[PDB]
């Protein structure tokens, strides 16, 4: 029918801020738990492009302190609380790997600016 490959675009949220890989961001999320609601954030650099209709996620890599850890927060999830853009940078590459082990002043790549 006319439904195939459209239903991904139809599901896809429209107030989500605009992006390129190397945009740093903050994912704000819940702890979930047994009955009590608290919040938490995760910040870093996003090393790679999303846009997957409903399945779209920020794969932020954190790299602030300690050994590297990559986190995937799916955007379209109701427990994902808030999204500041902060810096929106350019890289002309698909992967950021040389910063995996260095976490000190590593997740703060520039705003592309005027």
């Amino acid at each position: 029918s006319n439904i195939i490959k459209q239903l991904e675009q139809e599901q896809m949220k429209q107030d989500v801020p605009s992006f390129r890989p190397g945009d740093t961001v903050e994912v704000k999320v819940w702890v979930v738990e047994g009955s009590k609601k608290r919040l938490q954030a995760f910040e870093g650099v996003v090393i790679a492009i999303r846009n997957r209709g409903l399945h779209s996620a920020f794969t932020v890599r954190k790299i602030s302190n300690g050994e590297g850890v990559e986190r995937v927060f799916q955007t379209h999830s109701p427990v994902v609380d808030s999204i500041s853009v902060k810096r929106r940078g350019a890289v002309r590459k698909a992967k950021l790997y040389y910063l995996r082990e260095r976490t000190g002043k590593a997740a703060r790549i520039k705003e592309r600016l005027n």
Binding site: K62, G66, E70, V72
Partner: protein
């Protein structure tokens, strides 16, 4: 882990350096572990002031997989390495009081209130 042998990282003040998976628990005719899984470790090193000594065999649960770990959205927390928190060998909950390095957010349950209230990550 997924294979036979597998050294992986100490996650507690219990030991040093590396400690060895001898088996997976929570079924048989298994070679390989799921995401939510309980591992069997021998301490392959130890530390003199740790809870345990070289070649003592105890129970454990996953905190990092180098592949990545998932449950709630199916989204992965993807790591630099495999690492494991020892449990009590029969009586559950961790034996060590500190986690060393980052944690998942797939560990967020009543039987793990011990390990997630720690400060290095997911508070």
């Amino acid at each position: 882990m997924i294979q036979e042998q597998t050294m992986l990282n100490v996650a507690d003040n219990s030991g040093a350096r590396r400690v060895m998976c001898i088996k997976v628990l929570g079924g048989s005719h298994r070679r390989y572990a799921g995401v939510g899984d309980i591992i069997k470790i021998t301490i392959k090193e130890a530390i003199p002031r740790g809870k345990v000594k070289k070649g003592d065999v105890l129970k454990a649960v996953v905190v990092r997989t180098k592949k990545g770990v998932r449950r709630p959205d199916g989204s992965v927390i993807r790591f630099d390495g495999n690492a494991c928190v020892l449990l009590n060998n029969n009586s559950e909950q961790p034996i060590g009081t500190r986690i060393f390095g980052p944690v998942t957010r797939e560990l967020r349950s009543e039987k793990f209130m011990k390990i997630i209230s720690l400060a290095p990550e997911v508070l």
